[PDB]
Short mmCIF file of C-alpha atoms and ligand atoms in Angstrom, two decimals:
data_model
loop_
_atom_site.label_atom_id
_atom_site.label_comp_id
_atom_site.label_asym_id
_atom_site.label_seq_id
_atom_site.Cartn_x
_atom_site.Cartn_y
_atom_site.Cartn_z
CA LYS R 10 -1.94 3.32 -20.82
CA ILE R 11 -0.21 0.77 -18.61
CA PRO R 12 -2.15 -2.40 -19.29
CA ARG R 13 -4.65 -4.11 -16.86
CA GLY R 14 -3.56 -7.42 -15.49
CA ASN R 15 -4.31 -10.46 -17.54
CA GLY R 16 -5.44 -12.59 -14.51
CA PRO R 17 -8.80 -13.28 -12.95
CA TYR R 18 -8.38 -10.94 -9.98
CA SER R 19 -9.13 -7.36 -9.58
CA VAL R 20 -6.15 -5.33 -8.45
CA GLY R 21 -5.60 -3.01 -5.52
CA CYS R 22 -2.66 -0.69 -4.71
CA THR R 23 -1.34 1.17 -1.60
CA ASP R 24 1.76 2.44 -0.05
CA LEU R 25 3.41 1.40 3.23
CA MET R 26 6.30 3.16 5.05
CA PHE R 27 7.53 1.66 8.26
CA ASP R 28 9.28 2.82 10.11
CA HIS R 29 9.21 6.56 9.09
CA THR R 30 12.99 7.02 9.01
CA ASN R 31 15.57 6.59 6.20
CA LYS R 32 16.42 3.14 7.58
CA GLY R 33 12.68 2.02 7.51
CA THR R 34 10.91 0.03 4.77
CA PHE R 35 9.10 1.95 1.95
CA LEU R 36 7.10 -0.04 -0.51
CA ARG R 37 4.22 0.09 -2.88
CA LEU R 38 1.84 -2.80 -2.49
CA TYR R 39 -0.25 -4.51 -5.34
CA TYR R 40 -2.69 -7.00 -4.18
CA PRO R 41 -5.77 -8.89 -5.25
CA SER R 42 -8.74 -6.62 -4.35
CA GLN R 43 -12.36 -7.13 -3.31
CA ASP R 44 -13.63 -4.13 -5.24
CA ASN R 45 -13.15 -2.54 -8.50
CA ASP R 46 -14.88 0.83 -8.20
CA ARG R 47 -12.14 2.89 -6.60
CA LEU R 48 -10.00 5.63 -8.11
CA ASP R 49 -7.07 4.52 -10.15
CA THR R 50 -3.58 4.91 -8.72
CA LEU R 51 -1.59 7.97 -9.42
CA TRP R 52 1.59 6.64 -11.31
CA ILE R 53 4.24 9.18 -10.23
CA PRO R 54 2.72 10.74 -7.04
CA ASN R 55 5.00 13.72 -6.18
CA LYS R 56 6.71 16.51 -7.97
CA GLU R 57 10.13 15.59 -6.44
CA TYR R 58 10.26 12.26 -8.40
CA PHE R 59 10.15 14.46 -11.55
CA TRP R 60 13.09 16.48 -10.24
CA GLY R 61 14.76 13.12 -9.48
CA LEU R 62 14.21 11.90 -13.06
CA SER R 63 15.64 15.15 -14.50
CA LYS R 64 18.95 14.72 -12.38
CA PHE R 65 19.06 11.13 -13.50
CA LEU R 66 18.79 12.37 -17.13
CA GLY R 67 21.47 15.00 -16.59
CA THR R 68 19.12 17.88 -17.53
CA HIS R 69 18.25 21.12 -15.79
CA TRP R 70 15.67 20.68 -12.98
CA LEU R 71 13.23 22.54 -15.10
CA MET R 72 13.04 19.53 -17.40
CA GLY R 73 11.57 17.96 -14.21
CA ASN R 74 8.72 20.58 -14.10
CA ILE R 75 8.11 19.74 -17.88
CA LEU R 76 8.16 15.98 -17.16
CA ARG R 77 5.65 16.64 -14.49
CA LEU R 78 3.31 18.75 -16.80
CA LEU R 79 3.53 15.64 -19.22
CA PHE R 80 3.10 12.67 -16.92
CA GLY R 81 1.96 14.04 -13.42
CA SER R 82 -1.79 13.25 -13.81
CA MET R 83 -1.16 9.92 -15.30
CA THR R 84 -2.64 6.88 -13.59
CA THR R 85 -2.19 3.13 -13.55
CA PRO R 86 -5.05 0.62 -13.46
CA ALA R 87 -4.97 -0.40 -9.82
CA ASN R 88 -7.88 0.38 -7.40
CA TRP R 89 -6.13 2.78 -4.80
CA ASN R 90 -6.71 1.63 -1.27
CA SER R 91 -9.40 -0.94 -2.33
CA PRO R 92 -9.92 -3.61 0.35
CA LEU R 93 -7.86 -6.81 0.22
CA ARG R 94 -9.73 -9.83 -1.49
CA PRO R 95 -10.30 -12.01 1.65
CA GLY R 96 -10.44 -15.76 1.99
CA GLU R 97 -7.18 -16.90 0.46
CA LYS R 98 -3.50 -16.92 1.34
CA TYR R 99 -1.37 -15.15 -1.38
CA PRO R 100 2.28 -15.81 -2.31
CA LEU R 101 4.47 -12.81 -2.06
CA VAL R 102 6.93 -11.13 -4.56
CA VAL R 103 9.40 -8.51 -3.33
CA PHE R 104 10.29 -6.35 -6.29
CA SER R 105 13.38 -4.34 -6.74
CA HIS R 106 13.68 -1.25 -9.18
CA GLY R 107 16.58 -0.24 -11.28
CA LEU R 108 19.03 2.80 -11.28
CA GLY R 109 17.29 6.05 -11.52
CA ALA R 110 13.88 4.34 -10.95
CA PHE R 111 11.64 4.16 -7.92
CA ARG R 112 8.79 2.06 -6.50
CA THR R 113 6.02 3.06 -8.81
CA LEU R 114 7.53 2.45 -12.25
CA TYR R 115 6.84 -1.29 -12.45
CA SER R 116 3.02 -1.31 -12.09
CA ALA R 117 2.59 -3.31 -15.34
CA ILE R 118 4.50 -6.20 -13.72
CA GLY R 119 3.05 -5.67 -10.19
CA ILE R 120 -0.56 -5.29 -11.43
CA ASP R 121 -0.37 -8.41 -13.74
CA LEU R 122 1.23 -10.48 -10.95
CA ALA R 123 -1.47 -9.24 -8.55
CA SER R 124 -4.20 -10.03 -11.03
CA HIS R 125 -3.08 -13.76 -10.88
CA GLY R 126 -3.21 -13.76 -7.03
CA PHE R 127 0.18 -12.47 -5.89
CA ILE R 128 0.72 -9.81 -3.25
CA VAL R 129 3.70 -7.72 -4.68
CA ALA R 130 5.83 -5.44 -2.53
CA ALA R 131 7.78 -3.08 -4.69
CA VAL R 132 10.32 -1.55 -2.38
CA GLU R 133 11.76 1.94 -2.61
CA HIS R 134 15.55 1.91 -2.04
CA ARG R 135 17.29 4.34 0.12
CA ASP R 136 20.69 3.68 -1.23
CA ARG R 137 20.72 6.79 -3.44
CA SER R 138 20.15 4.53 -6.49
CA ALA R 139 16.52 5.84 -6.80
CA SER R 140 15.97 9.05 -8.79
CA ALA R 141 14.40 10.28 -5.63
CA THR R 142 12.81 8.83 -2.48
CA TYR R 143 11.59 10.17 0.81
CA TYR R 144 11.21 9.62 4.64
CA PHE R 145 10.87 11.50 7.82
CA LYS R 146 13.60 12.89 10.15
CA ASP R 147 11.63 11.95 13.28
CA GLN R 148 8.19 11.24 14.60
CA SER R 149 7.13 14.97 14.74
CA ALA R 150 7.96 15.30 10.96
CA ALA R 151 5.99 12.08 10.03
CA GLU R 152 2.97 13.43 11.96
CA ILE R 153 2.72 16.65 10.01
CA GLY R 154 3.98 15.09 6.74
CA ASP R 155 7.25 17.10 6.61
CA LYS R 156 8.94 14.92 3.91
CA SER R 157 12.79 14.91 3.62
CA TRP R 158 13.94 13.94 0.12
CA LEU R 159 16.99 11.96 -0.93
CA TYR R 160 18.09 12.14 -4.56
CA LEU R 161 20.16 9.97 -6.87
CA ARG R 162 23.90 10.00 -6.26
CA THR R 163 26.13 10.57 -9.23
CA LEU R 164 29.45 8.60 -9.03
CA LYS R 165 32.92 9.39 -10.14
CA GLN R 166 34.47 6.46 -12.24
CA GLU R 167 36.94 5.96 -9.27
CA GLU R 168 33.75 5.14 -7.01
CA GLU R 169 31.82 2.83 -9.30
CA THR R 170 33.00 -0.71 -8.23
CA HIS R 171 33.07 0.07 -4.56
CA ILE R 172 29.94 2.18 -4.23
CA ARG R 173 27.67 0.03 -6.49
CA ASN R 174 28.64 -3.04 -4.41
CA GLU R 175 27.70 -1.06 -1.19
CA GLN R 176 24.44 -0.29 -2.82
CA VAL R 177 23.50 -3.68 -3.90
CA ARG R 178 24.10 -5.00 -0.48
CA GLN R 179 22.03 -2.38 1.11
CA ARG R 180 19.38 -3.18 -1.61
CA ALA R 181 19.47 -6.79 -0.42
CA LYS R 182 18.95 -5.74 3.16
CA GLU R 183 16.02 -3.61 2.23
CA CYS R 184 14.40 -6.63 0.37
CA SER R 185 14.89 -8.90 3.46
CA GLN R 186 13.70 -6.06 5.76
CA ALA R 187 10.65 -5.57 3.64
CA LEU R 188 9.92 -9.43 3.76
CA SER R 189 10.14 -9.38 7.55
CA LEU R 190 7.68 -6.51 7.86
CA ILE R 191 5.23 -8.11 5.60
CA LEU R 192 5.63 -11.39 7.45
CA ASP R 193 5.14 -9.57 10.77
CA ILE R 194 2.15 -7.80 9.67
CA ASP R 195 0.86 -11.23 8.53
CA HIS R 196 1.65 -12.41 11.93
CA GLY R 197 -0.69 -9.59 13.40
CA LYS R 198 1.94 -7.10 14.75
CA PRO R 199 0.30 -3.70 14.87
CA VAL R 200 2.08 -1.40 12.49
CA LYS R 201 1.16 2.38 12.21
CA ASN R 202 1.81 3.25 8.63
CA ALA R 203 3.88 6.44 8.52
CA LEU R 204 1.83 7.49 5.49
CA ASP R 205 -1.77 8.37 6.51
CA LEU R 206 -3.69 6.33 4.07
CA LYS R 207 -7.10 4.65 4.30
CA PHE R 208 -5.85 1.24 4.02
CA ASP R 209 -6.04 -0.78 7.14
CA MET R 210 -2.75 -2.99 7.39
CA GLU R 211 -4.73 -5.48 9.58
CA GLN R 212 -6.25 -6.87 6.40
CA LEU R 213 -2.99 -8.57 5.63
CA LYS R 214 -3.23 -10.60 8.89
CA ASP R 215 -3.28 -14.31 7.92
CA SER R 216 -3.20 -13.27 4.18
CA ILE R 217 0.29 -14.39 3.09
CA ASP R 218 1.35 -17.94 2.00
CA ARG R 219 4.38 -17.71 4.17
CA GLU R 220 6.76 -20.20 2.42
CA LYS R 221 5.92 -18.99 -1.02
CA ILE R 222 8.11 -16.00 -1.38
CA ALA R 223 10.04 -14.86 -4.47
CA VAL R 224 12.19 -11.84 -5.19
CA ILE R 225 12.10 -10.19 -8.75
CA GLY R 226 13.72 -7.08 -10.18
CA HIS R 227 15.00 -5.22 -13.23
CA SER R 228 18.46 -3.91 -14.15
CA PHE R 229 20.08 -2.92 -10.75
CA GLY R 230 17.07 -4.77 -9.30
CA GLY R 231 18.23 -7.91 -11.13
CA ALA R 232 21.46 -7.76 -9.38
CA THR R 233 19.55 -7.20 -6.22
CA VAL R 234 17.51 -10.41 -6.76
CA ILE R 235 20.83 -12.34 -6.80
CA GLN R 236 22.42 -10.65 -3.85
CA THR R 237 19.10 -11.13 -1.85
CA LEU R 238 18.86 -14.90 -2.71
CA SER R 239 22.59 -15.32 -1.56
CA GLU R 240 21.89 -13.79 1.81
CA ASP R 241 18.24 -14.68 2.59
CA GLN R 242 17.10 -18.34 2.34
CA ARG R 243 13.52 -17.19 3.05
CA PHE R 244 13.39 -16.23 -0.76
CA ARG R 245 12.74 -19.61 -2.41
CA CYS R 246 13.52 -18.35 -6.02
CA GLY R 247 14.34 -15.35 -8.02
CA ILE R 248 13.65 -13.77 -11.39
CA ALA R 249 16.26 -11.35 -12.79
CA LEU R 250 14.75 -9.05 -15.50
CA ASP R 251 17.58 -7.85 -17.72
CA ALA R 252 19.92 -7.89 -14.80
CA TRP R 253 22.81 -5.31 -14.61
CA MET R 254 25.54 -7.71 -13.08
CA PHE R 255 28.34 -5.05 -12.32
CA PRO R 256 27.32 -4.31 -8.71
CA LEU R 257 27.79 -8.02 -7.63
CA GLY R 258 30.84 -9.05 -5.57
CA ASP R 259 32.98 -11.92 -6.75
CA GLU R 260 31.83 -13.89 -3.67
CA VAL R 261 28.11 -14.12 -4.53
CA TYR R 262 28.29 -16.24 -7.66
CA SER R 263 28.85 -19.68 -6.09
CA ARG R 264 26.41 -18.80 -3.19
CA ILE R 265 22.97 -18.86 -4.81
CA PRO R 266 21.24 -22.25 -4.04
CA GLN R 267 17.80 -21.12 -5.19
CA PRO R 268 16.37 -21.39 -8.64
CA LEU R 269 17.03 -18.32 -10.76
CA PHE R 270 15.48 -17.11 -14.11
CA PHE R 271 17.19 -14.55 -16.40
CA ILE R 272 14.73 -12.73 -18.66
CA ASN R 273 16.65 -10.51 -20.96
CA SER R 274 16.01 -7.99 -23.69
CA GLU R 275 17.71 -8.54 -27.09
CA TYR R 276 19.44 -5.24 -27.19
CA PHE R 277 20.64 -4.32 -23.65
CA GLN R 278 22.86 -7.33 -23.13
CA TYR R 279 26.59 -7.51 -23.70
CA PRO R 280 29.39 -10.23 -23.24
CA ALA R 281 30.72 -9.00 -19.83
CA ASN R 282 27.15 -8.95 -18.37
CA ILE R 283 26.31 -12.45 -19.93
CA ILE R 284 29.63 -13.93 -18.65
CA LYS R 285 28.55 -12.86 -15.23
CA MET R 286 25.13 -14.57 -15.51
CA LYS R 287 26.97 -17.67 -16.63
CA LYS R 288 29.02 -17.55 -13.46
CA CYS R 289 25.68 -18.26 -11.60
CA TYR R 290 25.55 -21.65 -13.31
CA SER R 291 26.47 -25.12 -11.85
CA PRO R 292 24.87 -28.61 -12.46
CA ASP R 293 23.14 -28.74 -9.04
CA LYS R 294 21.44 -25.46 -9.60
CA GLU R 295 18.31 -24.61 -11.54
CA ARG R 296 19.06 -21.84 -13.99
CA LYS R 297 16.94 -20.71 -16.99
CA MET R 298 17.62 -17.87 -19.43
CA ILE R 299 15.47 -16.35 -22.31
CA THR R 300 15.69 -13.42 -24.42
CA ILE R 301 12.67 -11.44 -25.81
CA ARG R 302 13.17 -10.72 -29.49
CA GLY R 303 13.17 -7.10 -30.58
CA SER R 304 13.06 -5.93 -27.10
CA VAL R 305 15.05 -3.09 -25.35
CA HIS R 306 15.96 -2.51 -21.62
CA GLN R 307 12.99 -0.35 -21.10
CA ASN R 308 10.41 -2.87 -22.04
CA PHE R 309 10.36 -4.06 -18.46
CA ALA R 310 9.47 -0.72 -17.08
CA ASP R 311 6.26 1.50 -17.29
CA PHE R 312 7.63 4.25 -19.38
CA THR R 313 7.43 1.87 -22.34
CA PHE R 314 3.66 2.52 -22.15
CA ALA R 315 3.93 6.25 -21.43
CA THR R 316 4.53 7.68 -24.88
CA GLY R 317 3.37 6.90 -28.54
CA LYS R 318 4.94 4.28 -30.77
CA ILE R 319 7.11 6.66 -32.76
CA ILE R 320 8.50 8.86 -30.02
CA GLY R 321 8.87 5.65 -27.89
CA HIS R 322 11.23 4.03 -30.52
CA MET R 323 13.41 7.20 -30.74
CA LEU R 324 13.83 7.49 -26.92
CA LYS R 325 14.61 3.73 -26.58
CA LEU R 326 11.60 3.37 -24.34
CA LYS R 327 10.05 0.93 -26.91
CA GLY R 328 11.70 -1.81 -29.13
CA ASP R 329 10.77 -3.42 -32.45
CA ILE R 330 8.49 -5.58 -30.48
CA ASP R 331 5.05 -4.38 -29.19
CA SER R 332 5.31 -3.39 -25.56
CA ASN R 333 2.12 -5.23 -24.46
CA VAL R 334 3.36 -8.45 -26.27
CA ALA R 335 6.86 -8.19 -24.64
CA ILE R 336 5.65 -7.75 -21.07
CA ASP R 337 2.93 -10.51 -21.56
CA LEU R 338 5.81 -12.92 -22.37
CA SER R 339 8.03 -11.84 -19.45
CA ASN R 340 5.07 -11.89 -17.05
CA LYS R 341 3.53 -15.26 -18.25
CA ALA R 342 7.05 -16.96 -18.34
CA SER R 343 7.68 -15.46 -14.83
CA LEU R 344 4.31 -16.99 -13.70
CA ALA R 345 5.23 -20.36 -14.97
CA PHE R 346 8.57 -20.21 -13.25
CA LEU R 347 7.10 -19.08 -9.96
CA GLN R 348 4.61 -21.79 -9.95
CA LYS R 349 7.26 -24.58 -10.54
CA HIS R 350 9.61 -23.34 -7.91
CA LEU R 351 7.07 -22.19 -5.14
CA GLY R 352 4.82 -25.17 -5.66
CA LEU R 353 1.62 -23.19 -6.55
CA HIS R 354 -1.45 -25.05 -7.54
CA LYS R 355 -2.69 -22.67 -10.26
CA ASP R 356 -2.63 -22.97 -14.08
CA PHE R 357 0.54 -20.95 -14.72
CA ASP R 358 2.22 -24.18 -16.14
CA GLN R 359 0.22 -23.48 -19.31
CA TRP R 360 3.25 -21.15 -20.01
CA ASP R 361 5.97 -23.84 -19.17
CA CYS R 362 7.16 -23.54 -22.85
CA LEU R 363 8.14 -19.93 -22.38
CA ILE R 364 10.62 -20.81 -19.64
CA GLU R 365 12.50 -22.73 -22.47
CA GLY R 366 12.07 -19.68 -24.83
CA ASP R 367 9.69 -21.72 -27.21
CA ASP R 368 7.75 -18.88 -28.80
CA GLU R 369 8.20 -17.03 -32.10
CA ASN R 370 9.12 -13.91 -30.13
CA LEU R 371 11.64 -15.71 -27.58
CA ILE R 372 15.22 -16.88 -28.15
CA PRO R 373 16.21 -19.63 -25.94
CA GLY R 374 19.07 -18.56 -23.67
CA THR R 375 20.82 -15.57 -25.33
CA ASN R 376 21.63 -14.04 -28.65
CA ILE R 377 25.04 -12.86 -27.25
CA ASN R 378 28.23 -14.66 -28.14
CA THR R 379 31.05 -14.96 -25.54
CA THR R 380 34.07 -15.79 -27.45
N1 LIG G 1 10.21 3.42 -16.43
C1 LIG G 1 11.29 3.56 -16.12
C2 LIG G 1 12.60 3.83 -15.74
C3 LIG G 1 13.11 5.14 -15.15
C4 LIG G 1 14.40 5.38 -14.72
C5 LIG G 1 15.28 4.33 -14.83
C6 LIG G 1 14.88 3.09 -15.24
S1 LIG G 1 16.03 1.77 -15.12
O1 LIG G 1 15.95 1.01 -16.33
O2 LIG G 1 15.91 1.28 -13.82
N2 LIG G 1 17.51 2.61 -15.17
C7 LIG G 1 18.43 2.06 -16.26
C8 LIG G 1 18.53 2.80 -17.55
C9 LIG G 1 19.55 2.85 -16.62
C10 LIG G 1 13.66 2.77 -15.65
CL1 LIG G 2 -11.40 5.53 -4.19
NA1 LIG G 3 20.07 -12.72 5.79
#
């Protein structure tokens, strides 16, 4: 089980695709909800995501069918299409997924943020970094629900530097585009969701605290945070969860005026990556770094909750640390950081000590030596 949020708000979830094309925005929305008696949200909602995962693993497509058998009925505890909780303006997080992931695999984070009064837009990237994603070729296809699928692109070593940079820039553009869509819906623009879902987008009108925007992401999504900040000053701070820094161009490092928080796992990181993070530092800039003790790269994503303890540790989905404990730390520390740099008037400053890595399961800064 993916944990419920630790906050006071019930959580809703829905999907938005606008426009319907491969250049449109696709996101999964997590939001504070009015009601708590809805069906839970299907975690991986189409068979094609499993085929995507199987290609990402480098196995036959029939491993995909087996994955679907194992995980295809699994839910996450958000009230599917529940009405938005009215009467309050919510700050906004745009969330970016990692390589081979897609929009639905960070519900533990999105749910928990939502439970504390954030609206969270988990984008699905169309850069071929997702295991799978979909869209519609034209208006006819969207009407009848004739999905076209786009699968993970595998790269030759000769393509890595160039194509990973092209992708992170596209990812950044997709984050900015997703922000603009949400802000336009906030400002009342009719938007016909290309997915025929019983969640009226007009609910979001006047529901966003329009200056309180952050960008968060994991792995490739952590590089995406940084690229995004460098090109869209509407994002007021960023949180990079175990960032994979390789995609970033040399130019971005000096170009991030906003506060930025690195939350790392103990076992993922390596000197080349850490050196790149430290290139983001300068005395005028607000930078924080913590490392979760006994954690692995997958502690930030939902598959850390999908299998047992034993098989979890074998597959590197789990680390030495308990998964709920690790994500509570990442999420609470994130909450404190967001409150500080978005100027929120909540109680998230109770976790200020976690930003400085003051906790028995935190290492201040990094365990990685870079000499
Ligand atoms: N859950 C989950 C999940 C599924 C697929 C890929 C990811 S990743 O961490 O973005 N990709 C990194 C490992 C290379 C996470
Ligand atoms: Cl329902
Ligand atoms: Na921009």
